[PDB]
Point group: C3
Chain length 106, copies 3
Amino acid sequence: METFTVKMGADSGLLQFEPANVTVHPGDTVKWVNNKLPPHNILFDDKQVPGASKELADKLSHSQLMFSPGESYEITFSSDFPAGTYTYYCAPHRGAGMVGKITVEG
Amino acid sequence: METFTVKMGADSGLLQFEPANVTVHPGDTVKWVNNKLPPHNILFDDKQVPGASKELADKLSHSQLMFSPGESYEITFSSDFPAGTYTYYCAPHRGAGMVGKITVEG
Amino acid sequence: METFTVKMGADSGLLQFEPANVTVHPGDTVKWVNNKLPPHNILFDDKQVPGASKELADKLSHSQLMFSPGESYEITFSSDFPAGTYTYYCAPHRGAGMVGKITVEG
Ligand SMILES: [Cu+2]
Ligand SMILES: [Cu+2]
Ligand SMILES: [Cu+2]
Ligand SMILES: [Zn+2]
Ligand SMILES: [Zn+2]
Ligand SMILES: [Zn+2]
Ligand SMILES: [Zn+2]
Ligand SMILES: [Zn+2]
Ligand SMILES: [Zn+2]
């Protein structure tokens, strides 16, 4: 099992998740870490996860704003997660296109 | 089973859900569709659903802001939903009285 | 079983939960009541509840803003709640340090 670190805010100051796209395998963890230009958060819309389960998208969403440097949030995409793409965004920086995509391999 | 379309924002530009009040039967779906003056969202307070279940109100709430024209969200009020009134509102337009009510018939 | 009333906003106008720290026993209820300077809400971060369960923190969080005088929200810390500290904050007044802590006794 691997852990993928996603920086929220690039080192240079770009309002992006870095890296934006990550492919994971069942059991892998994605760890988001507050990097530059907080606050950020991590939203998955109900229609943006495989099978469009609102329960799933809600449980994955960290809608609470993250302010502190190095503040982190992790999701383990375990065996019961459906394969497909999970597209997320940062609410504060939606206008800037601060978005990402986790692919659970099938 | 029927699907009731609720417009978020009237065609004229009134900040309302149209229609604001809908009566549904078990198995029916309510589909909210982004119509005018986005963003909107759909919040049910824990005390505003029958039996005051916070778990139920949370699961029905689409708190994520909806920005795009025609963006939609649906809830199927299935057999296990308690009869009674489910009162919701739009956070951005709470001040304008952008509110609605779904009645599940008993 | 006891109910602990926590005022959101002190009578004087301080932006605090009063009292900020409460110790509860299994079966006890905490009732938050809108007191001064609304809106307030009540957020528990996933890492701020015992065992860091995001499901638990989400279910305890009343993220919807509370505007009306006397508007209340209750949580019963029942037998299945893990012992330890549950640290929460108000989003609008995070900058002012409007924070609290519920201790479930073990
Ligand atoms: Cu951001
Ligand atoms: Cu609205
Ligand atoms: Cu407050
Ligand atoms: Zn892997
Ligand atoms: Zn949605
Ligand atoms: Zn019907
Ligand atoms: Zn409430
Ligand atoms: Zn007690
Ligand atoms: Zn968190």
